[PDB]
Amino acid sequence: NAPKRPPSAFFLFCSEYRPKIKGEHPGLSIGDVAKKLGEMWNNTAADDKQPYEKKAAKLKEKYEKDIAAYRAKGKPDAA
Protein backbone atom coordinates (compact mmCIF):
# COMPACT_ATOMS: atom_id res chain seq x y z
CA ASN A 1 0.00 0.00 0.00
CA ALA A 2 2.77 2.34 -1.29
CA PRO A 3 6.08 0.83 -2.41
CA LYS A 4 8.69 2.52 -0.22
CA ARG A 5 12.47 2.68 -0.81
CA PRO A 6 15.04 -0.20 -0.54
CA PRO A 7 18.87 -0.05 0.11
CA SER A 8 21.36 2.58 -1.11
CA ALA A 9 24.44 0.40 -1.81
CA PHE A 10 25.91 1.62 1.44
CA PHE A 11 22.85 -0.01 3.08
CA LEU A 12 24.30 -3.52 2.55
CA PHE A 13 27.87 -2.64 3.63
CA CYS A 14 26.24 -0.81 6.54
CA SER A 15 24.14 -3.75 7.79
CA GLU A 16 27.27 -5.92 7.68
CA TYR A 17 29.03 -3.37 9.94
CA ARG A 18 26.29 -2.01 12.24
CA PRO A 19 27.11 -4.60 14.98
CA LYS A 20 30.88 -4.89 14.24
CA ILE A 21 31.66 -1.18 14.83
CA LYS A 22 28.95 -0.63 17.38
CA GLY A 23 30.58 -3.42 19.44
CA GLU A 24 34.19 -2.32 18.81
CA HIS A 25 33.19 1.34 19.34
CA PRO A 26 30.36 1.16 21.95
CA GLY A 27 30.65 4.97 22.27
CA LEU A 28 28.75 5.70 19.04
CA SER A 29 25.05 6.23 18.29
CA ILE A 30 23.04 5.12 15.23
CA GLY A 31 24.23 8.37 13.64
CA ASP A 32 27.91 7.76 14.48
CA VAL A 33 28.04 4.06 13.62
CA ALA A 34 26.38 5.24 10.42
CA LYS A 35 28.52 8.34 9.95
CA LYS A 36 31.80 6.40 10.42
CA LEU A 37 30.90 3.46 8.24
CA GLY A 38 29.24 5.95 5.81
CA GLU A 39 32.70 7.46 5.23
CA MET A 40 34.23 3.97 4.91
CA TRP A 41 31.62 3.13 2.28
CA ASN A 42 32.54 6.21 0.29
CA ASN A 43 36.16 5.07 0.40
CA THR A 44 35.56 1.26 0.46
CA ALA A 45 37.27 0.93 -3.00
CA ALA A 46 34.27 1.54 -5.31
CA ASP A 47 35.04 -1.89 -6.73
CA ASP A 48 33.94 -3.11 -3.27
CA LYS A 49 30.75 -1.01 -3.50
CA GLN A 50 29.67 -2.52 -6.84
CA PRO A 51 28.79 -5.97 -5.23
CA TYR A 52 26.44 -4.31 -2.73
CA GLU A 53 25.44 -1.50 -5.03
CA LYS A 54 24.06 -3.86 -7.70
CA LYS A 55 21.56 -5.08 -5.09
CA ALA A 56 20.45 -1.61 -3.95
CA ALA A 57 19.97 -0.70 -7.63
CA LYS A 58 17.99 -3.86 -8.57
CA LEU A 59 15.62 -3.21 -5.68
CA LYS A 60 15.11 0.58 -6.13
CA GLU A 61 14.42 -0.32 -9.76
CA LYS A 62 11.82 -2.95 -8.76
CA TYR A 63 10.18 -0.43 -6.44
CA GLU A 64 9.90 2.25 -9.10
CA LYS A 65 7.91 -0.19 -11.30
CA ASP A 66 5.86 -1.55 -8.44
CA ILE A 67 4.88 2.00 -7.55
CA ALA A 68 4.37 2.90 -11.19
CA ALA A 69 2.04 -0.11 -11.08
CA TYR A 70 0.72 0.70 -7.58
CA ARG A 71 -0.66 3.90 -9.05
CA ALA A 72 -1.28 2.37 -12.48
CA LYS A 73 -4.12 0.51 -10.70
CA GLY A 74 -2.44 -1.60 -8.00
CA LYS A 75 -3.84 -0.04 -4.78
CA PRO A 76 -6.20 -1.70 -2.20
CA ASP A 77 -9.09 0.01 -4.05
CA ALA A 78 -7.72 -0.64 -7.55
CA ALA A 79 -6.92 -4.41 -7.64
* DSSP per position, 5-74: ----SHHHHHHHHHHHHHHH-TT--TTTHHHHHHHHHHTS-STTTHHHHHHHHHHHHHHHHHHHHHHHHT
Method of structure determination: NMR
For 3, which DSSP code? -
- CA 31 centroid distance within chain: 15
**What value does the CA radius of gyration of the chain take, rounded to a whole number of Å?**
16
Q: What number does CATH give the domain 1-79?
A: 1.10.30.10
22 neighbors 33 (Cβ within 8 angstroms)? yes
